Design an enzyme around this catalytic site. Sequence first.
Site, PDB file in Angstrom:
ATOM      1  N   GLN A  62       6.361   9.819  -7.245  1.00 38.04           N
ATOM      2  CA  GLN A  62       6.145   8.427  -7.592  1.00 38.04           C
ATOM      3  C   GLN A  62       4.660   8.124  -7.619  1.00 38.04           C
ATOM      4  OE1 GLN A  62       8.424   5.776  -5.168  1.00 38.04           O
ATOM      5  NE2 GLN A  62      10.277   7.014  -5.313  1.00 38.04           N
ATOM      6  N   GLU A  63       4.279   7.216  -8.515  1.00 38.24           N
ATOM      7  CA  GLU A  63       2.903   6.746  -8.642  1.00 38.24           C
ATOM      8  C   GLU A  63       1.964   7.910  -8.975  1.00 38.24           C
ATOM      9  OE1 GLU A  63       2.347   3.460  -8.373  1.00 38.24           O
ATOM     10  OE2 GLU A  63       0.234   3.660  -8.932  1.00 38.24           O
ATOM     11  N   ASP A  64       2.224   8.515 -10.132  1.00 35.40           N
ATOM     12  CA  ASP A  64       1.379   9.567 -10.699  1.00 35.40           C
ATOM     13  C   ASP A  64       1.320  10.807  -9.806  1.00 35.40           C
ATOM     14  OD1 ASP A  64       0.787   8.123 -13.003  1.00 35.40           O
ATOM     15  OD2 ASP A  64      -0.943   7.145 -12.079  1.00 35.40           O
ATOM     16  N   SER A  65       2.473  11.439  -9.623  1.00 30.14           N
ATOM     17  CA  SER A  65       2.517  12.740  -8.969  1.00 30.14           C
ATOM     18  C   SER A  65       3.490  13.644  -9.705  1.00 30.14           C
ATOM     19  CB  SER A  65       2.915  12.607  -7.503  1.00 30.14           C
ATOM     20  OG  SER A  65       1.929  11.905  -6.784  1.00 30.14           O
TER      21      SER A  65
END
Lengths: 49, 251, 64, 49, 49
Positions: free
Chosen positions: E7-10
């Site tokens: 989540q959130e750019d991973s």
Amino acid sequence: FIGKIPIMLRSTYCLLNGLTDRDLCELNECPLDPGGYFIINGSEKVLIA
Amino acid sequence: VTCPNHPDAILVEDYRAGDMICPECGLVVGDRVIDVGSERTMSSSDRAMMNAFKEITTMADRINLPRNIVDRTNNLFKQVYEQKSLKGRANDAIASACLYIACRQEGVPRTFKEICAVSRISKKEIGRCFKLILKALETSVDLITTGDFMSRFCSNLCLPKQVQMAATHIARKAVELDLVPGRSPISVAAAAIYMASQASAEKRTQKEIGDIAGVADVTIRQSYRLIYPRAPDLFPTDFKFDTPVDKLPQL
Amino acid sequence: MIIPVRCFTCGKIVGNKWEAYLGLLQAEYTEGDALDALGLKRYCCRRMLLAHVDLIEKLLNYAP
Amino acid sequence: YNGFTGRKITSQIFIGPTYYQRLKHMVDDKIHSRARGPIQILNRQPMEG
Amino acid sequence: SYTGYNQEDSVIMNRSAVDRGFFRSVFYRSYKEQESKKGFDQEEVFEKP
Ligand SMILES: [Zn+2]
Ligand SMILES: [Zn+2]
């Protein structure tokens, strides 16, 4: 005698001008290297327009 | 070395943590107390000296000599300057003499004739100041060898190493036998080079060689006359004639 | 630089199929048919040979 | 299919091959810590090593 | 969306593909040292202390 001028690689005054890939590899040089930079005290410098 | 419980015997310095440790008991006696090394117009004195070192750089630039040689040339002068026994003498001669010495100190002397090319000082005055510096700085020197000049001269003639190396043996054999107990080793070397060049396709006239070495063309001819009796046997065992020793010219 | 010995996703052995692949493209085969003559039927094992650049043949030009 | 329990996933997942690159910023190069380290000499402020 | 770790750019990535050469690389680095005579007694030299 006056002085010494740096030489841009792969120019008409370099030692690599007009060589074939069989000789560029024999001097341990890359045939894909573009040229167009100076070698000054080991470093590789490039001039920005 | 000290501790409250014992006089310390050893105090290791731990650079990594930057700590001072006394192992045999266990108490840092010094904390954050050992730094770890790890890893013009205004000038009046050292102004004419500075000009002389700019002029030293100029002399060593006319020959493009490595900075390490010049580094001790500058140091030699500084030393000669500091004593000031020889203070009342021309600076440029001393600089030039410092230069001759450094080349010898680097085991690669350059002829005064060469040193003259880059300076106004007469060979005589350079040699006088030279003696004075040897006396001034109280230091010994070394004898010259022919082979040290085999490189550049043969280079200046673009002679191949085989000729160059052959000449060196010829020279080396000649001096070991003292075939020429008189003529300067450079004069002797040039004739060997001549002989060598005359033993290869890369023959040259004595005057051209003479012109390169600076010696008289008759001095080579004389030196040649001295080495010629042994021309055949003076050559190295690993050689390939371009002209028979029998066919070696006479002069 | 050199053909990997195993597909990264399946695990199927690929490292022994590079010379046979060049040999089939040598005669007349299309890349779509040469890959079927070798038995690569998942599109994860065909990406292995289809997109491989062989740099080892250019580092053998420099004398040791 | 789910990998832990083997059950199907109610939605259908969009899958396919793409071309990724590996940037230069790795984590082995950005971690550092200090706890009572070496200090300077003149101002006695914490210093590196 | 699989387990919340992307989540959130991973990105989640396959561990047993890294073990077969996926995105493995090397890293070179050079160091210079130069012996120098900055002084008569202050001369340096390479030797085993
Ligand atoms: Zn103690
Ligand atoms: Zn696969």
